[PDB]
Amino acid sequence: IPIEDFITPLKFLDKARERPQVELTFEETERRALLLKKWSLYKQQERKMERDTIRAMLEAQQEALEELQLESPKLHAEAIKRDPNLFPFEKEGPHYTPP
Amino acid sequence: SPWRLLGALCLQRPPVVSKPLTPLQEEMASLLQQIEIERSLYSDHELRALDENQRLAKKKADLAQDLEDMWEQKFLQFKLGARITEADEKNDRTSLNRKLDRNLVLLVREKFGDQDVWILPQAEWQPGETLRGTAERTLATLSENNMEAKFLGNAPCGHYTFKFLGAKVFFFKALLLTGDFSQAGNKGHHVWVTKDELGDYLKPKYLAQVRRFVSDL
Amino acid sequence: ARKERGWRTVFPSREFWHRLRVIRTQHHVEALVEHQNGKVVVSASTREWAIKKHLYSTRNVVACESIGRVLAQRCLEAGINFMVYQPTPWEAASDSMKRLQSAMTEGGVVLREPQRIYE
Amino acid sequence: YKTKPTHGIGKYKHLIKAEVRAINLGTDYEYGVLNIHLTAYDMTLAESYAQYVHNLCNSLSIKVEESYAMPTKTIEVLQLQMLLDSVLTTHERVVQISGLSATFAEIFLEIIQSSLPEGVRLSVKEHTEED
Amino acid sequence: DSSRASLTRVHRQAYARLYPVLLVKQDGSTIHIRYREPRRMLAMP
Amino acid sequence: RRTPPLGPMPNSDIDLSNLERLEKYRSFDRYRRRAEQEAQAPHWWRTYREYFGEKTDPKEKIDIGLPPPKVSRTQQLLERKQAIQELRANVEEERAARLRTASVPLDAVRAEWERTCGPYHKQRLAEYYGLYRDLFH
RNA sequence: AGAGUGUAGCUUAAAAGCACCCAACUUACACUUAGGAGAUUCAAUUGACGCUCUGA
Numbered sequence: 045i046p047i048e049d050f051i052t053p054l055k056f057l058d059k060a061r062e063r064p065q066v067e068l069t070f071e072e073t074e075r076r077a078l079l080l081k082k083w084s085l086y087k088q089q090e091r092k093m094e095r096d097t098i099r100a101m102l103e104a105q106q107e108a109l110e111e112l113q114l115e116s117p118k119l120h121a122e123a124i125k126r127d128p129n130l131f132p133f134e135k136e137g138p139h140y141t142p143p
Numbered sequence: 144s145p146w147r148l149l150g151a152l153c154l155q156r157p158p159v160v161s162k163p164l165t166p167l168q169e170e171m172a173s174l175l176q177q178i179e180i181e182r183s184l185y186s187d188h189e190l191r192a193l194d195e196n197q198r199l200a201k202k203k204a205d206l207a208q209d210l211e212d213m214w215e216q217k218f219l220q221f222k223l224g225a226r227i228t229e230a231d232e233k234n235d236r237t238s239l240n241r242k243l244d245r246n247l248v249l250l251v252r253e254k255f256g257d258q259d260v261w262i263l264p265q266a267e268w269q270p271g272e273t274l275r276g277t278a279e280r281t282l283a284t285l286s287e288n289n290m291e292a293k294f295l296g297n298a299p300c301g302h303y304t305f306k307f308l309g310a311k312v313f314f315f316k317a318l319l320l321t322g323d324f325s326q327a328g329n330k331g332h333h334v335w336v337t338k339d340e341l342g343d344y345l346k347p348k349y350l351a352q353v354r355r356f357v358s359d360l
Numbered sequence: 361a362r363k364e365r366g367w368r369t370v371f372p373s374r375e376f377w378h379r380l381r382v383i384r385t386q387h388h389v390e391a392l393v394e395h396q397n398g399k400v401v402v403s404a405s406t407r408e409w410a411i412k413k414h415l416y417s418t419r420n421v422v423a424c425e426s427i428g429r430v431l432a433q434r435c436l437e438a439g440i441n442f443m444v445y446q447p448t449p450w451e452a453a454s455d456s457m458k459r460l461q462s463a464m465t466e467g468g469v470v471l472r473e474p475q476r477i478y479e
Numbered sequence: 480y481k482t483k484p485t486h487g488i489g490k491y492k493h494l495i496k497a498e499v500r501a502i503n504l505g506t507d508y509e510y511g512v513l514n515i516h517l518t519a520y521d522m523t524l525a526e527s528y529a530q531y532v533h534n535l536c537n538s539l540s541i542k543v544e545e546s547y548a549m550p551t552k553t554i555e556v557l558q559l560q561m562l563l564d565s566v567l568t569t570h571e572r573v574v575q576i577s578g579l580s581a582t583f584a585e586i587f588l589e590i591i592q593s594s595l596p597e598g599v600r601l602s603v604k605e606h607t608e609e610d
Numbered sequence: 611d612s613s614r615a616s617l618t619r620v621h622r623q624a625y626a627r628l629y630p631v632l633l634v635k636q637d638g639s640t641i642h643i644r645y646r647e648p649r650r651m652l653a654m655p
Numbered sequence: 656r657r658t659p660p661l662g663p664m665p666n667s668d669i670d671l672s673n674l675e676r677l678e679k680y681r682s683f684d685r686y687r688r689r690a691e692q693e694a695q696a697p698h699w700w701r702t703y704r705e706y707f708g709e710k711t712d713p714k715e716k717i718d719i720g721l722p723p724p725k726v727s728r729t730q731q732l733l734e735r736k737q738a739i740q741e742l743r744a745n746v747e748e749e750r751a752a753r754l755r756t757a758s759v760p761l762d763a764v765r766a767e768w769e770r771t772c773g774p775y776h777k778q779r780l781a782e783y784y785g786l787y788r789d790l791f792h
Numbered sequence: 793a794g795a796g797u798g799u800a801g802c803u804u805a806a807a808a809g810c811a812c813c814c815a816a817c818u819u820a821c822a823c824u825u826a827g828g829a830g831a832u833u834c835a836a837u838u839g840a841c842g843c844u845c846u847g848a
Binding site: 050077080081084085086087088089090091092095099129132 | 803812815819827829
């Protein structure tokens, strides 16, 4: 029985004027435009770094594969197993404050 | 074969403390706060405060901030767990209570004819087990510690050799779940290290090219 | 003159004499005036220095408006007064093409060809 | 026409296709259809990391079967000094993916756990009985 | 590393103003979570 | 009765093994670009271009013009670029571009268009009007 | 110490075309719209800075 809170609750009917201050200032808009462009450039840098990480340690696993082909094939098989005892993974997110 | 099948591991303590934000990121947390305040609707606390203000105005012509104050004072009496682990541990690089915003990896001092230096924990492959078996037996043969820790998968992670008939190193990756190291004053120096200090502890091709697969992000 | 009628099941319609075609690449904005046979009559690009040295960036609605004013001037100069522009729905709804069409109309070209005199 | 060399030029139903559980590859190995469960006490943070992992899986070409929802559970925490109450909500996202090699499992596990945000439960399960 | 998905806002047309709140868990540990009331500390037994 | 094709089939170099791996047109614009390129490709069957297009002789129409002026591409791109970042360093240019109120000097544009690329466009329009066919054969 | 070399991620492109991000929409993806960031390792075909490969 799939029922979710994607629906909007009935309690929002007629009082949205806690912020009738939709008027905005020109200096604010200029700051937001320049600053969203800075955010775009920053996320470009972060994505470039994470792609470098992906490519690097995929290259590491590849070089592992050809060295293992150089050495031994049963070694190759037992390092390409599907190890169905470690898939049920769980990890706590990085906390704000330590215990 | 003129080679030695030697495995190694990469036991990593994950970051516990969330990484502090850059100036751009804290500015944009503030902006996201501003715009969600602007584009929300229907705060029940604000309803209660405004309605109580209006009825108080009616009574004065003819509440919520006390609750605000009391949660503020209980916030100000409650202390946070201090995150300044640099001050909490001086420079004790062997302790697990070091930098919690970053990711850590184990390293052991060892002596060898080639290099009497810091290495990742080693074993020589017995012909009747998986190199995952060599990984868990290194975890068993480390010095008086219970790491309840998880292996990321039966797949190699790093491959570095030197010739001395050739010692091949079969670097892994493991993940410390919640274990710790008994006998903290160990005779064998166990350092917990990042990449920036892996620069200090690991010099060249056999041990410093591990920057290919150590993950700092 | 004959307009190539037909092609009712495909896009674009080829019943015209001259056509405006706009190519919005990821760096540049290109605008072509081309006959029905396929020869390019007039072209105007943000690829050229003469437009590059006055634009801040070659991918703006400012870029499209500038290339529209340049191409409208070149069309008045070449004598091409009537053309048919065939945009996709998202193109026509886009602000770049609206500023393009406004710039062309205020430049002086009409984006609707007159009807053929059959009799 | 059938007798002409240009026969079958307008064929498209071979280029298009229209009308798996615990898949394997034998000497190679590949995981089946698997669930990235991602629950949080924050709907915002849960939806954000679900969007992140969906975009990353599209970027590095793992076929996401579907991104769906598992219901918000509302828990009332009761404390006394009748007990005063604090109501918390937990919301759940599932990213169900299809083609996943045990070779690239280390790529994906390491990167997702490193990019995991503050206080989001990340657990990957087999799609066998959860519905 | 824990920022990429953390820096977001509520992407709903109709939503309440949720406040930045630290909740404690029983080992004594605080997480930034959003709550309807301005109560800054939430307690978990 | 069948006849083998006289050349490669159109959708023949696409691998049909499993259709879920291949990258895909998710856009009518991408398909339109690919289809226009394929339409401009020669092809060995009967074509609207064959029956309706102008069959000009492949004589590689002879140039009887002046030799082109010589320019130094390195310093040309250096001065073009330095103009680009000085205009991108002017702060009000960003404000005009973002507020969509910028403009362009058409007289200077047309003058240095005559300087740089006007000859080729004029040659193309002369070819379209058919002087090189009529006046110069 | 010696070779393959050298256009941003890619191109029998020559300063281009595709890839690639941020916002709007979308549960999300995708599409689209608005924006964004970029490259020719340096000196008159060679010479000398950087990556990869080989050895000590």
